[PDB]
Amino acid sequence: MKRIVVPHRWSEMNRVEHPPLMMKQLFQGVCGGLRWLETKSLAQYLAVRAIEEGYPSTPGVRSLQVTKQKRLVSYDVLDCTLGSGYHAGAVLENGGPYTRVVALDCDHDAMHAARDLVEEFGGDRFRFYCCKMSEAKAMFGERSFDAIMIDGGVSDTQLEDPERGFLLDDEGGHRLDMRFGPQMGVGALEYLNTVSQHTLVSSLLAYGLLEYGQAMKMSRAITRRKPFVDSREVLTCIEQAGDELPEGGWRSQGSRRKSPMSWKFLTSLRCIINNEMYELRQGIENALLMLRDDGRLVVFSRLPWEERLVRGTVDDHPHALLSYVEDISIDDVQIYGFTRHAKMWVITRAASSAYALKNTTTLTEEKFRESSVRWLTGMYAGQTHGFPANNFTFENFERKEWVTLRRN
Amino acid sequence: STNDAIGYFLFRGAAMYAGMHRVFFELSKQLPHFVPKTMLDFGAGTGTAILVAKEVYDPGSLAYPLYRSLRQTMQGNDSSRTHQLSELRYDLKRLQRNNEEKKKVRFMAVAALLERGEVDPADLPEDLKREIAEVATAAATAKKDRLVREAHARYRDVVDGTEWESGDPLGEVRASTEDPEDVIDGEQGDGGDDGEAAKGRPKTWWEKLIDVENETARTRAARRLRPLQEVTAVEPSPGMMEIGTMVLHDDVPNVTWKRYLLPEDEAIQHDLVVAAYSLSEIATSENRRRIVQQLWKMTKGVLVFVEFANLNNFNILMEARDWILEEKDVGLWDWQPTIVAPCPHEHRCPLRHCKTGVKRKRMRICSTEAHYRSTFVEVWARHMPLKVGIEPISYLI
Amino acid sequence: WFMPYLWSKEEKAARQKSMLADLEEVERRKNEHSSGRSAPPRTSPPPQFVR
């Protein structure tokens, strides 16, 4: 009678979790909306129906044959990145019953946070997969979730782990594999030893920070001095070109433009590997496909290029409307140690006429004269009679393809 | 850049799609038993070569169905022949069977299973009705793949308003369960020895007919023949990578996007390494002789070079043919390079050293050509409406 | 002859300086670091045995 256990490693013994960013401000954002009130009105409509048929009550003032039993009022939420599960746990706890959370993550180490949530409540309220946030539309389809919450960046579990990278003040040579999941390729030690000087500059300029006068100085130091045994020889070369790293590490409460070139390089090199420009742009535009009509979308932004991407998407997408943007409360910066520039962008979807709201504020006279030219010259034309264009239509089915679904 | 990657994919999309379907048609014919369980794509700018390798070796797990009437969907692979057998059996029951007795079992069992749920009593008085239950379980699993093809997205069953089943939410006991179907030669035991003595039993045409007409063992033959589990794509430019991710993530799930090929990376052994239109794009500063020698050492199975038919590209491909054929007598005989397609002699190519090719440029390229239905982009940029486009390609398997 | 005829004195001086700098960098990197790998090995090799 010998029980077998695998010996724990130091990253497993001294594992730290991620602090809650905002709990009450998220629950009003990711739950509350037009999809929430008609859900809460449907629960009150079913309660007064239950006392009508003759069920036992309390004195108080008011597809196919295997799956015939479908669920009641339940409010389906998708978590693109659960991380430590505090934002995924606030929806199922404070929402009470009739709520669900489907959680995704890039790292398999979030199964520990997914395991601890099922022990409280599971099987019918929690569901977990391991995938990127851009592959959510490919595995859930359009109009799938009543709400979608999106986080970004690195959790505090991956920061303090010496095997996951992200250690700046450890004074020891560890491999600088700073990536969020196994679905990406090379890490930063293998990137900076193989990237050219031109490819590194063009990747740094995509994230706004570390502009062309500063990006060519940091890339000159990398490409000329790259025997890189470990992260320690990289951090000496980075801090020699620019200033030394701040004492706050990755989380610096200073200004964005007043931050040193060493912090601007390391925060952008983290974004180069995991491709946060592609992951957040496709994570937002697929979420507006997967949302229901008048749903809610919550995206957290902690970087100034992320504030341009959320602002740039909602003005051009013909369903997205920014409900409100909330900054981080000042008390959560002290006890938890978050970034002061962290905002919460609560985006809602429109049923129709989303551009009629945006033309109230943003409609200039030069936009009106440009719109007259594009109708006269016909620049709003697409393609219909080409080879791939004849097989494409809108979301509503035609009369020609309803006869196809009868036989198929 | 990403603006160049849009114009590269919209203009050369159907051209590279047809050039890769030409090579995989010969690879499925010449090597019928090959299933590339892990795939590396060198220089995968746009994921056309990964997408056709999904279409050739796994036509059933795609989001959208293939046009079944085409010659390009008739491959010689074991996974393709399994999917073609299901589509053939659909055509047999619909066209070559005039009896509507197939309908009589269907609409009765639909009416039977509907009425036993809430009106009729239990199935306990009717004995030996396991033929109804095991078909209805198999018909239910046929409905699960039916809604995937209608919605063009897997994991649609959790989207619906059905209740989630309590127990295993994370998928831990489904990915770690011991399969009772895989039995190696020693784990079998204690049977009648006449089954292991009498050899050559299923040589009759009647016993071959019962071998294919049942579908319970075909799914057991498909779970062992996993066609594409892990796919690795290599691309240095960020403009091509973010558009190659948009092509592949709808139909090819869980693709690892590496940014650079390292001399460290040749310790990972893949079944298929595809360098599609990538040998010509290697810059002159990088040693191309080192890269094509590294790509050969990452092959469990097939290494596929596909290039456009040009004078500079054919000299690159014939040098890469000579560099890999130089690795013949280095060691173990079972790992030496063999040319499967096109040149069967393994000497120097006679068209490369012909007399006529000195003063004639036409007699220089040992290539082939693929035909395709051109899109609206190619007929706009060439000013002539070509309903059939021509893509000349030089390939090497 | 056209390429040295086009170049000035400081351009040829910068060309020779960059050529000698890249040459000595390549020579010191092939004398110090071996076996490629685009990375130093970070660990002493394990002890080999006579087989």
Binding site: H198 | - | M3, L6, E10, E11, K12, A14, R15
Partner: peptide, 27 residues
């Protein structure tokens, strides 16, 4: 003007290629 758009696209090595330095170019 379409050819000058790719000058910011080439690598820094063969960018100024008829001249060794890029300081004395036309700016």
């Amino acid at each position: 003007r379409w050819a000058a758009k790719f000058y910011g696209q080439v690598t820094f090595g063969p960018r100024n290629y008829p001249y060794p330095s890029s300081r004395w170019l036309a700016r």
